[PDB]
Design a protein around this ligand. Structure first.
Ligand SMILES: [Ba+2]
Lengths: 196, 196, 196, 196
């Protein structure tokens, strides 16, 4: 068993690091099963040469909507749950992490099947906020996922490998995804079918 | 589909911006139905020439009250729910947003009918707190809505329009509202009637 | 109706203010009924010549305890609920406020009767944290209430008075309390009695 | 009764203090009963010569896992509950505190018996974040507990002693633990047995 963080708080990642360079999000986001729950996931990179303290991830769904009373809201925003309730949005960012939004009843994608996806007009804004340790100052990074950038039935490729008592990140594969068997029904549709 | 935020985190609003100038709240607040729920809503402007990180909205109700034991609290404060529970008060402020407080059982307006409104002695203090990205420092903006400034049965006019692959804001209409069909009963009264 | 906060965010308190001087907590804390609920309350002062942004109140109970397994914890700490769940601990501090902890089942005082109070060995640490607007920096103020400093069956005297379209604070009375009719049974005892 | 904190916010710990020196976590973590609940606990030290404001503790479980769909997550992170829900992770750090994670159904250790412990490949990362009062800046401290560093059926030795109206900390014993009678069944196993 090779430790991830040593007793003194120093992490064992990127052999010979120094703990502006910019933080990256994967180009695409994927949707696929994790433990019988359907999920939307995107990857968030670290900063090779500093920690980010009080680091947090959040996401907004941007989608123009019409209320049952006919009020039209251009580019309405609602929050996507990526760990707010359990503090799993309080990231320990010391290597690329896959953030996961479980597609449940209060999720906006609850009624969206695979066929249905490309028909929807929406954008997922991902927003990472923290305090760059070295800089002293509060930073923010953002990105965006549009309908055509969400890949149904895929998973993120692993990027973490242990080499010589240090964990190294194959950054080439950061953005890379592979296909996996994934039902094509909506989260709602799977739940109904599951319940009889 | 024209993106709101580009892959690199740069938003497509206010063609040719630079991302002290002061943040504005609409002059008035409106109350009206959104998806069968009665709502109080106010608009919060952005800062044309910077983002506001770790941006959050909150509101206090100021109203002198008397306890069932006869204790009089001048200008008592209680919190108005504008997304605290679901992180929808964690704003992504890159254009004017309508903030919405759904008038439910734990809301202070739950028992307030249209006729009843102008009789009540109360004030809604809205408070926006964030970290002006360019400035480095934590800012706070406030405003106030008194009974006579709350407009029952109205909605905010849309201000967002897509022009030339950039979203522009018709700031003339920022404060403007229009009337819409809205029952005159209290949220409580509508619920009771609804439940038989 | 004289506004508390004007449209531009400027409050109408302390006619002719400038918005180190130190923030004060009342010397004593009181326990008494508010709307059929028993409460512990302490007063927290403002800073006459600046706002405090992202202001929050919290309290710890310090009391040495012994676990059912015989482990002795000197000066154990547990959190006192003063609005954490509903964001009513996110203070809008622009004049002295009475903070209230409702003495319910999850409260530590739930089983403490009036007679019982002076027998208990405990301390309430109150801690106010914010960002002094003028200073730019994060501040913290603390105080302490010991058994003998908690006054059962009392209330805080009002200190807020409207004079000449500005709200003034009679700081002489900041610390002053008066007696009021208050049962002597514990919160638990009142609940049981209430439930038959 | 000797006060822990005086009326003016000054604490009565470390007679003759000044309120870089580094913050320490105990070398080991222990698991044992507190009030019929099984717990994992680690100790977190203070900074002798300053307070830490907006201080908070959090912990991540690092453990490589495989999803029921065969996706392998190297060094997956999930949050350990150390008071997030009740604000007991908002520390009042003015002397060494034992932080406690109660091993309940949503805890990752729920199914881990004593025998089972040394077989598991996992790491507990503890992360303390605050604002060093004197420094003005936001700090972060971290440490790590691996399987072999978790001591089953033990407790932390008390380190706090009252001497001459000041509380002193016997820092020699900071890391020291003693054994105590503790069942060897998992939290799950104890619950089942308990429920008949
Ligand atoms: Ba902060």
């Amino acid at each position: 068993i090779q430790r991830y963080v040593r007793k003194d708080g120093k992490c064992n990642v990127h052999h010979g690091n120094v703990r502006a360079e910019t933080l990256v999000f994967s180009t695409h986001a994927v949707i696929s099963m994790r433990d019988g729950k359907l999920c939307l996931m995107f990857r968030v990179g670290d900063l090779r040469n500093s920690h980010i303290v009080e680091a947090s991830i959040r996401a907004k769904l941007i989608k123009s909507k019409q209320t049952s009373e006919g009020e039209f809201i251009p580019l309405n925003q609602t929050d996507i749950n990526v760990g707010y309730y359990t503090g799993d949005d309080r990231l320990f960012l010391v290597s690329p992490l896959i953030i996961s939004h479980e597609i449940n009843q209060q999720s906006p994608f609850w009624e969206i099947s695979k066929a249905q996806l490309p028909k929807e007009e929406l954008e997922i804004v991902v927003i990472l906020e923290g305090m760059v340790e070295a800089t002293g100052m509060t930073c923010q990074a953002r990105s965006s996922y549009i309908t055509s950038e969400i890949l149904w039935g895929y998973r993120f490729t692993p990027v973490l490998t242990l080499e010589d008592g240090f964990y190294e990140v194959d950054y080439n594969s950061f953005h890379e995804t592979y296909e996996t068997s994934t039902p094509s029904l909506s989260a709602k549709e799977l739940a109904e079918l599951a319940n009889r």
